Symmetry: C2
Subunit: 218 residues, 2 copies
Amino acid sequence: LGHLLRDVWSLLNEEERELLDKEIQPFPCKKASTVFSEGDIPNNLFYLYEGKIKILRRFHISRIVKPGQFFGMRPYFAEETCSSTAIAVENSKVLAIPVEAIEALLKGNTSFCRYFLKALAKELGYAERRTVTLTQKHVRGRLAETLLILKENFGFENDGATLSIYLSREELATLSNMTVSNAIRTLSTFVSERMLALDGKRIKIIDCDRLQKTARSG
Amino acid sequence: LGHLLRDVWSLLNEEERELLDKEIQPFPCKKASTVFSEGDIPNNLFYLYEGKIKILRRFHISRIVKPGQFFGMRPYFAEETCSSTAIAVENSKVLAIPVEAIEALLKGNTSFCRYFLKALAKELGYAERRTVTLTQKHVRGRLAETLLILKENFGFENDGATLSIYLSREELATLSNMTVSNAIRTLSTFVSERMLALDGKRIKIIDCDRLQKTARSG
């Protein structure tokens, strides 16, 4: 199963690949189940092969993990407990790598180290950007930004306009630092302005260019 | 000058130490000068030997760097431009390490890699925590939290109560996601409640236990 970790697998030699194949475990992950909980001591790193995982800690959703990313990596490297709970947004295929195996691999392989260095640096860039967005942008900018981030990370359905992720109003509100009332109020306005169209949990972006202007300008 | 980087120097062998000593440069850093600017392409990593550096990008102050920390490391590892401007809060002694030298060292040394892995993971933990604080805590909690963070990172003067950092009201307000009016209003109340005492830019913590309760409870 180690080969499913496409980017990382290419960095490993034959002995390292054997070790990974030996230690990696499938991790059952039904929608709404929890991978780990805030306060937990890290025993594994997790790789999201398929599906979607929300990281949360009012609650705050710090990220929604997309396929091909690692999670639970932060507290391992920081030598801390998990700051957050990880919950599946949909049925997901997760691979667990024991921290002992991770550590052996890191010790022998600077390329493997540098992969995680980039991953953490990227996450930190996103995190610091998000702080500015959430504290400084007004309701319209915050929600538009959230929607464009989901567009970027999860993409569109076959129609090329409907977001391929189906968050509750509560998740969308929390993600964008607003009340559900404000979220539904703002979505309503975005439909009135013909930037979006709504159908249950389905959000269709009908004017992306203008939505982007709203994210940036207000 | 490489030996001044105490933690890192201990991880390096003789050849690596020679390379570091050869490539490291002193970097003049007067109060109010800028080390690098938002949008800059990384040419060096910077190590704060002595002094204090604010990282900023309304402006947002993402951190105040303390002695013994690296900065400008994020965009190097992420392969991005600088997201922020770094400005000295006081006369500082900064050491610059060319990214070419950094890269050679990382390639040969997993311990060196793992040092930065921990540093980035720590920073990410602080960043994600700060997002929750700044978006969810009320004015009293936010400012108390800010003050306790400065206490932790910069400590006390000889009196064991006066913070050893002397930020403007504007810096303190920005750091804590409030208007200067709200900051000065809240400081005024903290003095009325005998948690603080104020003397220009000097902030004296006279009831730390209660300040901590205020940070946590409101």
